[PDB]
Amino acid sequence: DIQVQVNIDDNGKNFDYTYTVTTESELQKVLNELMDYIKKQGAKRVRISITARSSKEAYKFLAILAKVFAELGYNDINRKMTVRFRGDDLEALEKALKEMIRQARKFAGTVTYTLDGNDLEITITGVPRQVLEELAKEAERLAKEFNITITITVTVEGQLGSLEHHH
């Protein structure tokens, strides 16, 4: 249901792990554990990905990543989104692609994509949080219009910021 992937770069070494969880509450408990660790041990850089089933959750997950970095005094240095569609009608899949990437380029975003069999993957970078929220809306919209399943991954990468900026 909900998948959260964490990369912690503690320079010279590197740690990756993933939990799958079913509620927002279990999600929060993973993030709390990670905040405690960061507060107490630090890191050169941290990357967090959360995979939603809907645009409402994606919106919520982006707001949750924001509080996480705020609390840590981390600067949001990097954000992206991966939409994954899956379908049997190739033609429907290719229509979803055509429109998904038009919209993203319309908001000055850069896209990357791969189509393989039933699975279709689109990564969007270089746009502010506000846009990724819209493009999630659009993605869910398109998934419904073409009757294809959909995944939404929001990804944030940050590092510890200035004392002055946190204040």
Author numbering: 3 to 169
Task: Quote the paper.
The backbone geometry at the junctions between the original domains is regularized, and the sequence at the newly formed interface is optimized to stabilize the single integrated domain structure. Crystal structures of two such proteins demonstrate that complex beta sheet structures can be designed with considerable accuracy using this approach and provide a proof-of-concept for the hypothesis that complex beta topologies in natural proteins may have evolved from simpler beta sheet structures in a similar manner.
A first extended sheet protein was created by inserting a designed ferredoxin domain into a beta turn of the designed TOP7 protein to create a half-barrel structure, with the two sheets fused into a single seven strand sheet flanked by four helices. The CD spectra show both alpha and beta structures. The structure shows excellent agreement with the design model, particularly in low B-factor regions, with C-alpha RMSD ranging from 1.76 to 1.85 Å among the four protomers in the crystal. The most similar SCOP domains had weak TM-align scores (0.54 and 0.51), and the sheets in these matched structures have different connectivities than those of the designs, suggesting that the two designed proteins have novel folds. The beta strand connectivity is quite different in the designs than in these closest structural matches.
